[PDB]
Design an enzyme around this catalytic site. Structure first.
Site, PDB file in Angstrom:
ATOM      1  CG  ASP B  49      -0.439  -0.398   2.482  1.00 10.96           C
ATOM      2  OD1 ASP B  49       0.512   0.243   2.984  1.00 10.96           O
ATOM      3  OD2 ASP B  49      -0.985  -1.368   3.053  1.00 10.96           O
ATOM      4  CD  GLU B  51       2.035   2.849   5.456  1.00 13.92           C
ATOM      5  OE1 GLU B  51       1.304   2.586   6.417  1.00 13.92           O
ATOM      6  OE2 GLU B  51       3.238   2.506   5.388  1.00 13.92           O
ATOM      7  CD  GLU B 144      -4.006  -7.205  30.134  1.00 13.90           C
ATOM      8  OE1 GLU B 144      -4.107  -6.201  30.889  1.00 13.90           O
ATOM      9  OE2 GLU B 144      -4.210  -7.185  28.901  1.00 13.90           O
ATOM     10  CE  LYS B 148      -5.983 -11.169  28.434  1.00 17.33           C
ATOM     11  NZ  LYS B 148      -5.942 -10.223  27.277  1.00 17.33           N
TER      12      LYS B 148
HETATM   13  N1  LIG Z   1      -0.074  11.023  12.159  1.00 16.69           N
HETATM   14  C1  LIG Z   1       0.694  11.230  13.381  1.00 16.69           C
HETATM   15  C2  LIG Z   1      -0.028  10.905  14.558  1.00 16.69           C
HETATM   16  O1  LIG Z   1      -0.888   9.644  14.333  1.00 16.69           O
HETATM   17  C3  LIG Z   1      -1.583   9.149  15.539  1.00 16.69           C
HETATM   18  O2  LIG Z   1      -2.354   7.990  15.211  1.00 16.69           O
HETATM   19  C4  LIG Z   1      -1.637   6.880  14.921  1.00 16.69           C
HETATM   20  C5  LIG Z   1      -2.531   5.613  14.938  1.00 16.69           C
HETATM   21  O3  LIG Z   1      -3.553   5.803  15.974  1.00 16.69           O
HETATM   22  C6  LIG Z   1      -3.101   5.585  13.712  1.00 16.69           C
HETATM   23  O4  LIG Z   1      -3.479   4.325  13.277  1.00 16.69           O
HETATM   24  C7  LIG Z   1      -4.277   4.427  12.085  1.00 16.69           C
HETATM   25  C8  LIG Z   1      -5.754   4.225  12.505  1.00 16.69           C
HETATM   26  O5  LIG Z   1      -6.143   5.306  13.333  1.00 16.69           O
HETATM   27  C9  LIG Z   1      -6.726   4.088  11.302  1.00 16.69           C
HETATM   28  N2  LIG Z   1      -8.044   3.641  11.750  1.00 16.69           N
HETATM   29  C10 LIG Z   1      -6.235   3.038  10.302  1.00 16.69           C
HETATM   30  C11 LIG Z   1      -4.820   3.383   9.819  1.00 16.69           C
HETATM   31  N3  LIG Z   1      -4.407   2.384   8.813  1.00 16.69           N
HETATM   32  C12 LIG Z   1      -3.827   3.414  10.995  1.00 16.69           C
HETATM   33  O6  LIG Z   1      -2.540   3.712  10.424  1.00 16.69           O
HETATM   34  C13 LIG Z   1      -1.406   3.286  11.199  1.00 16.69           C
HETATM   35  O7  LIG Z   1      -1.496   1.853  11.570  1.00 16.69           O
HETATM   36  C14 LIG Z   1      -1.219   0.842  10.452  1.00 16.69           C
HETATM   37  C15 LIG Z   1      -1.157  -0.474  11.038  1.00 16.69           C
HETATM   38  N4  LIG Z   1      -2.375  -0.655  11.878  1.00 16.69           N
HETATM   39  C16 LIG Z   1       0.096   1.242   9.711  1.00 16.69           C
HETATM   40  O8  LIG Z   1       0.209   0.392   8.556  1.00 16.69           O
HETATM   41  C17 LIG Z   1       0.066   2.704   9.324  1.00 16.69           C
HETATM   42  O9  LIG Z   1       1.316   3.130   8.634  1.00 16.69           O
HETATM   43  C18 LIG Z   1      -0.159   3.611  10.451  1.00 16.69           C
HETATM   44  N5  LIG Z   1      -0.257   5.072   9.945  1.00 16.69           N
HETATM   45  O10 LIG Z   1      -1.932   6.133  12.698  1.00 16.69           O
HETATM   46  C19 LIG Z   1      -1.134   6.900  13.399  1.00 16.69           C
HETATM   47  C20 LIG Z   1       0.344   6.436  13.274  1.00 16.69           C
HETATM   48  O11 LIG Z   1       0.769   6.724  11.935  1.00 16.69           O
HETATM   49  C21 LIG Z   1      -2.425  10.237  16.142  1.00 16.69           C
HETATM   50  N6  LIG Z   1      -3.716  10.421  15.315  1.00 16.69           N
HETATM   51  C22 LIG Z   1      -1.754  11.570  16.259  1.00 16.69           C
HETATM   52  O12 LIG Z   1      -0.833  11.516  17.394  1.00 16.69           O
HETATM   53  C23 LIG Z   1      -0.964  12.036  15.073  1.00 16.69           C
HETATM   54  O13 LIG Z   1      -1.857  12.498  14.068  1.00 16.69           O
HETATM   55  N1  LIG Z   2     -11.524   4.987  30.170  1.00 15.13           N
HETATM   56  C1  LIG Z   2     -12.415   5.441  29.083  1.00 15.13           C
HETATM   57  C2  LIG Z   2     -11.714   5.843  27.909  1.00 15.13           C
HETATM   58  O1  LIG Z   2     -10.490   4.929  27.623  1.00 15.13           O
HETATM   59  C3  LIG Z   2      -9.643   5.316  26.464  1.00 15.13           C
HETATM   60  O2  LIG Z   2      -8.520   4.432  26.312  1.00 15.13           O
HETATM   61  C4  LIG Z   2      -8.794   3.104  26.184  1.00 15.13           C
HETATM   62  C5  LIG Z   2      -7.526   2.353  25.681  1.00 15.13           C
HETATM   63  O3  LIG Z   2      -6.709   3.240  24.811  1.00 15.13           O
HETATM   64  C6  LIG Z   2      -6.868   2.029  26.821  1.00 15.13           C
HETATM   65  O4  LIG Z   2      -6.035   0.936  26.726  1.00 15.13           O
HETATM   66  C7  LIG Z   2      -5.203   0.827  27.896  1.00 15.13           C
HETATM   67  C8  LIG Z   2      -3.782   1.318  27.505  1.00 15.13           C
HETATM   68  O5  LIG Z   2      -3.784   2.693  27.234  1.00 15.13           O
HETATM   69  C9  LIG Z   2      -2.720   1.100  28.596  1.00 15.13           C
HETATM   70  N2  LIG Z   2      -1.383   1.484  28.104  1.00 15.13           N
HETATM   71  C10 LIG Z   2      -2.732  -0.366  29.040  1.00 15.13           C
HETATM   72  C11 LIG Z   2      -4.126  -0.745  29.554  1.00 15.13           C
HETATM   73  N3  LIG Z   2      -4.077  -2.108  30.099  1.00 15.13           N
HETATM   74  C12 LIG Z   2      -5.155  -0.634  28.412  1.00 15.13           C
HETATM   75  O6  LIG Z   2      -6.412  -1.152  28.902  1.00 15.13           O
HETATM   76  C13 LIG Z   2      -7.377  -1.544  27.900  1.00 15.13           C
HETATM   77  O7  LIG Z   2      -6.872  -2.621  27.007  1.00 15.13           O
HETATM   78  C14 LIG Z   2      -6.581  -3.922  27.766  1.00 15.13           C
HETATM   79  C15 LIG Z   2      -6.135  -4.945  26.857  1.00 15.13           C
HETATM   80  N4  LIG Z   2      -4.773  -4.631  26.354  1.00 15.13           N
HETATM   81  C16 LIG Z   2      -7.898  -4.343  28.482  1.00 15.13           C
HETATM   82  O8  LIG Z   2      -7.670  -5.521  29.281  1.00 15.13           O
HETATM   83  C17 LIG Z   2      -8.441  -3.228  29.329  1.00 15.13           C
HETATM   84  O9  LIG Z   2      -9.719  -3.685  29.950  1.00 15.13           O
HETATM   85  C18 LIG Z   2      -8.613  -1.958  28.610  1.00 15.13           C
HETATM   86  N5  LIG Z   2      -8.922  -0.823  29.604  1.00 15.13           N
HETATM   87  O10 LIG Z   2      -8.060   1.613  27.877  1.00 15.13           O
HETATM   88  C19 LIG Z   2      -9.091   2.365  27.587  1.00 15.13           C
HETATM   89  C20 LIG Z   2     -10.365   1.477  27.585  1.00 15.13           C
HETATM   90  O11 LIG Z   2     -10.794   1.328  28.947  1.00 15.13           O
HETATM   91  C21 LIG Z   2      -9.190   6.749  26.549  1.00 15.13           C
HETATM   92  N6  LIG Z   2      -8.134   6.908  27.660  1.00 15.13           N
HETATM   93  C22 LIG Z   2     -10.283   7.706  26.864  1.00 15.13           C
HETATM   94  O12 LIG Z   2     -11.118   7.880  25.668  1.00 15.13           O
HETATM   95  C23 LIG Z   2     -11.172   7.305  28.012  1.00 15.13           C
HETATM   96  O13 LIG Z   2     -10.457   7.458  29.230  1.00 15.13           O
HETATM   97 MG   LIG Z   3      -5.519  -4.686  30.461  1.00 11.35          MG
HETATM   98 MG   LIG Z   4      -2.205   0.849   7.899  1.00  9.50          MG
END
Ligand SMILES: NC[C@@H]1O[C@H](O[C@H]2[C@@H](O)[C@H](O[C@@H]3[C@@H](O)[C@H](N)C[C@H](N)[C@H]3O[C@H]3O[C@H](CN)[C@@H](O)[C@H](O)[C@H]3N)O[C@@H]2CO)[C@H](N)[C@@H](O)[C@@H]1O
Ligand SMILES: NC[C@@H]1O[C@H](O[C@H]2[C@@H](O)[C@H](O[C@@H]3[C@@H](O)[C@H](N)C[C@H](N)[C@H]3O[C@H]3O[C@H](CN)[C@@H](O)[C@H](O)[C@H]3N)O[C@@H]2CO)[C@H](N)[C@@H](O)[C@@H]1O
Ligand SMILES: [Mg+2]
Ligand SMILES: [Mg+2]
Ligand SMILES: [Ca+2]
Lengths: 253, 252
Positions: B49, B51, B144, B148
């Protein structure tokens, strides 16, 4: 650090209420509600489960967590303002079937004004368009990407990536099924077993999961065939159900 | 029926068409445009793809366009400079998977050295951030997973074990990548690159052999290998100073 260790539900709930007491001691009247979620919230925790708790705060813009281990067990406590939590509860991303079972597993242990009930009602009342949009996005952002990755494997390797990729594809297929049926899987371990029991599966998905669930992932030619069959089943399934994306433009912005 | 086979030259044509569209649509708000990923490294294969990243002058700009033509797929991210620099200097558990973007940049338009500044930021992140990320990974993911698979050993289901084993091997590869400050090139090379590094935790190479060969059906051998890798983690982290605080019953 040789943990996690075997624990009883009684021992886990003792820990939950100690944490509740500390939360109320520290934040007092800013605490709107405290709930247990995950397996312990459903009271189906097994011998080795972690502890997961959620706190609704009145503080504007509150969004923080505490996640820690004692070496024998692990706890995650999330703290969110009511507004931040309700917004999160009504957003449907591609992993909604993996994340939002939190809102269907809430055991309230403290609630000063129906706050956890409001959270549940918000989570269970999300509009159909959000699931439609999330499915269309999943097809483009994940499934189409994986197809390119396994087709590259077929022509240039490496087959050492194919078992992992096959697991990823089966998991994405389970998200597709979970979004379509609006179901949140109960545990990590039950995702695939629950996904394949649903009705009206994309053709080929059951068979793909059979390799992943059996662990028999060493026959690369069989896997590539199963992946292609599933990719065909995806195409038929999305047009049958109207998950249609306009792909006619080279650049759509 | 796509994605289809495409050449590097066909992908670069598409890239430059998108560049023109971005500059027509957003004009002077565009600071820079780059290609990343396999095409940015000029190692794209037949089905890759496309990017691309844009740096925008608009404060708080943060959006993406991701689409398919049925035959190929493109993702274009648009970020303000501040948002992108902040992201480039944050080290999460999956930094070895995500931040290769900043070491894969093929510049195609730049009005003020913005892509170089993003790259410099990504390459100059403080060592303490990797330490914190490793300790976080051990607690939030590895501990974790251990619970599991220990639950699987005592109550099932073993049908989760192959998928879980893949997750553990990937998490081990993040640990190794954070420690050596390396960003894997492609999804597909993570495990082969991880096991070539020095100072592997004991049991890690063995575990990965099951994952790489796809021989994931012998549940007792997998469980034994996960336990050995979990033991290897404990020795390794103590040896390298990634000490997890286990002293507090409730740390707040
Ligand atoms: N662009 C820079 C930063 O990106 C962040 O988000 C990161 C991450 O969540 C986000 O992930 C996005 C998703 O969301 C969206 N739903 C699908 C998309 N394919 C995926 O893309 C990402 O994950 C893929 C693998 N699964 C990789 O192949 C791809 O290169 C990568 N850009 O891409 C970003 C990393 O490239 C934040 N938005 C913000 O801190 C800032 O904009
Ligand atoms: N709490 C409600 C919402 O949660 C969001 O983030 C979500 C997600 O990114 C975040 O993921 C967090 C991570 O970050 C952190 N670094 C490790 C942590 N174990 C993980 O936890 C999550 O994924 C785990 C599986 N690996 C699950 O077992 C767990 O139940 C789940 N809370 O947990 C949240 C879901 O509970 C945003 N913070 C915000 O929109 C709002 O606070
Ligand atoms: Mg967890
Ligand atoms: Mg991607
Ligand atoms: Ca450069």
């Amino acid at each position: 650090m040789n943990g996690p260790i075997i624990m009883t539900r009684e021992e886990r709930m003792k820990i939950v209420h100690e944490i509740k007491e500390r939360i109320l001691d520290k934040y007092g009247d800013d605490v709107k509600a405290i709930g247990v979620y995950g397996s312990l919230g459903r009271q189906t925790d097994g011998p080795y489960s972690d502890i997961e708790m959620m706190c609704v705060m009145s503080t504007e813009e509150a969004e923080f967590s505490h996640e820690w281990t004692t070496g024998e067990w692990k706890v995650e406590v999330n703290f969110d303002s009511e507004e931040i939590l309700l917004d999160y509860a009504s957003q449907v991303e591609s992993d909604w079937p993996l994340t939002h079972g939190q809102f269907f597993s809430i055991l309230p242990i403290y609630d000063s004004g129906g706050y956890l009930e409001k959270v549940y009602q918000t989570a269970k009342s999300v509009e159909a368009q959000k699931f439609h949009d999330a499915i269309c996005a999943l097809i483009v952002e994940e499934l189409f990407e994986y197809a390119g990755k396994w087709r590259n494997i077929r022509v240039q390797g490496p087959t050492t990536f194919l078992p992992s990729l096959t697991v990823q594809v089966a998991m994405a297929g389970a998200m597709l099924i979970g979004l379509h049926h609006r179901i949140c899987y109960t545990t990590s371990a039950s995702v695939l077993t629950e996904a394949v029991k649903q009705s009206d599966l994309p053709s080929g998905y059951d068979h793909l999961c059979q390799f992943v669930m059996s662990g028999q992932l060493s026959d690369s030619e069989k896997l590539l065939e199963s992946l292609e069959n599933f990719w065909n089943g995806i195409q038929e399934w999305t047009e049958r159900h109207g998950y249609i994306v306009d792909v006619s433009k080279r650049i759509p912005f």
